[PDB]
């Protein structure tokens, strides 16, 4: 018998364990390590941020001041694994965060929560 796919959980490990990371996201002064190619494949806003020759591409660093780190952390979990286990607590902000970074499925997952 064939095991369930494991893509999500394995990718999840890269973010959890910070393996082979290539950029730094400073969120309200908290530095987080991540991977350009993965943010880019999942969010066209991240993708455009890394593609151009702007301060973020040059320094491999993003300064994010409008997202709370717990909320940012849930957004990142979604980016890498497609899941957001803690969504119910911050559904309000996460939805605002999802919409800013064009994470479409996440924006709808959130909307489902706000309908209750």
């Amino acid at each position: 018998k064939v095991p369930e796919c494991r893509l999500a959980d394995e990718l999840g490990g890269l973010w959890e364990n910070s393996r082979f990371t290539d950029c730094c996201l400073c969120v309200a002064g908290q530095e987080f390590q991540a991977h350009k190619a993965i943010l880019a494949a999942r969010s066209p806003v991240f993708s455009a941020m890394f593609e151009h020759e702007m301060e973020e591409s040059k320094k491999n660093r993003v300064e994010i001041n409008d997202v709370e780190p717990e909320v940012f952390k849930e957004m990142m979990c979604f980016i890498y694994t497609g899941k957001a286990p803690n969504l119910d607590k911050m559904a309000d902000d996460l939805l605002a965060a999802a919409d800013k970074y064009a994470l479409e499925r996440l924006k709808v997952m959130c909307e489902d929560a706000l309908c209750s």
């Binding site: 066209p44 806003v45 455009a48 941020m49 151009h52 020759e53 702007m54 301060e55 973020e56 591409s57 040059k58 993003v62 300064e63 994010i64 409008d66 800013k100 064009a102």
Partner: protein, 301 residues
């Protein structure tokens, strides 16, 4: 209004970022910051002010700075000046699109306006490429150098290729602009040229040389289209040269004295008789006519 004084502050920073991108000074800027700022003012429903300001900024540049570069280059390196403007314009727009990306997503379809990139294309086409003085000169330069190549000269095919493809892109996923600006005047002038040509070539009174000359021209009109002009132009140009070199003069070809199909038959010319089959088999009544004239010789014998 305090809330509408902030909103005007965001646009100023944004209008400044767009001009700075317009000048090729991209590196200093912060994508997040600009993107966040444009997001914010759309988010607050100021989408309209954003869009209108964008239209004003892009237009002022292409008209005050971009159009003047091209017009102050009319007799020298006009094609390259136009092409760099176009290349520079594409480059800016790709970075202005992306910072304004949220507007493309939640504002522009919902208000039945063009998206950012297409707006840039529309402004560039109307304010630069279609501006009377440039429009006419572009067309003349393209056609004239094509005319010169036909008279034997060597011309920069490269620039003709770049210019045609810009016209294409400016058609928005369609070929209207290339078709109205270039292809239509091109077909009009090729007709008048192959008309004069064929009458000059028939003034040779030699069928086989007329046939070889025509094939040469046809192979070349096709090679120019496939390597320089848009490939959709193939059919119209072939149709134009076949009508003017072969269809209009078939009876004249097969019936001309001392060079006509009868002269070749009696002589037994074969290499010449094959080259004539290959040419007349291009046309609608082309072989049918050869068979009529040949009938009349077989009639006697």
């Amino acid at each position: 209004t305090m809330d509408e004084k902030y909103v005007n502050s965001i646009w100023d920073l944004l209008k400044n970022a767009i001009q700075e991108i317009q000048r090729k000074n991209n590196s200093g800027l912060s994508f997040e910051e600009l993107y966040r700022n444009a997001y914010t003012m759309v988010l607050h429903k100021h989408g309209e002010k954003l869009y209108t300001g964008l239209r004003e900024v892009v237009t002022e540049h292409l008209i005050n700075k971009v159009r003047e570069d091209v017009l102050n280059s009319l007799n020298n390196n006009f094609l390259q000046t136009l092409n760099q403007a176009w290349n520079d314009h594409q480059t800016a727009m790709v970075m202005i699109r992306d910072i304004l990306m949220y507007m493309d997503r939640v504002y522009v379809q919902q208000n039945n306006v063009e998206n950012v990139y297409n707006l840039g294309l529309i402004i560039f086409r109307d304010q630069v490429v279609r501006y009377g003085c440039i429009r006419d000169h572009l067309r003349q330069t393209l056609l004239d150098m094509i005319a010169r190549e036909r008279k034997g000269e060597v011309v920069d095919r490269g620039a003709i290729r770049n210019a045609c493809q810009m016209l294409m892109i400016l058609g928005l996923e369609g070929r209207s602009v290339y078709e109205e600006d270039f292809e239509a005047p091109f077909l009009e002038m090729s007709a008048e040229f192959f008309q004069m040509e064929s009458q000059k070539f028939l003034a040779e009174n030699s069928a086989s040389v007329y046939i070889k000359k025509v094939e040469a021209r046809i192979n070349e009109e096709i090679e120019r289209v496939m390597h320089c002009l848009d490939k959709s132009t193939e059919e119209p140009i072939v149709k134009v040269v076949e009508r003017e070199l072969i269809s209009k003069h078939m009876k004249t070809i097969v019936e001309m004295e001392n060079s006509g199909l009868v002269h070749m038959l009696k002589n037994g010319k074969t290499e010449d008789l094959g080259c004539m089959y290959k040419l007349f088999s291009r046309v609608p009544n082309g072989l049918k006519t050869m068979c009529e004239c040949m009938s009349s010789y077989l009639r006697e014998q």
